[PDB]
């Protein structure tokens, strides 16, 4: 049952970025949060890529897959 989330997640991010280099790095950001498991790291990179409000959805976009506990803490770290 867990598969479309990837398409909707990748399709959404692509709808916002529409770029490749950006998605590559953003894809790298997620890969990092997976290995290092450091929410503080995701926020940093996500910013460098989401420096503009236009890429705001990335926060709410990634949250879903982001651990329920980390989701809240993710909110505590983010001002929005």
């Amino acid at each position: 049952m867990d598969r479309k989330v990837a398409r909707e997640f990748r399709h959404k991010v692509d709808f916002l970025i529409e770029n490749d280099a950006e998605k590559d790095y953003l894809y790298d950001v997620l890969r990092m949060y997976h290995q290092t498991m450091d929410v503080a790291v995701l926020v940093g990179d996500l910013k460098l890529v989401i420096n503009e409000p236009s890429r705001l959805p990335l926060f709410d976009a990634i949250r879903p897959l982001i651990p329920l506990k980390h989701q809240v803490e993710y909110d505590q770290l983010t001002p929005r």
Binding site: D2, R3, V5, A6, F9, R10, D20, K23, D24, Y27, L30, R31, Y33, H34, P64, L65, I66, P67, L68, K69
Partner: peptide, 18 residues
């Protein structure tokens, strides 16, 4: 819904190799 969707999308890209 935790520690499952991440690998789904993460690995999905790992397969795409884009």
């Amino acid at each position: 819904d935790d520690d499952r969707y991440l690998r789904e999308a993460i690995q999905e890209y790992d397969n795409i190799a884009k």
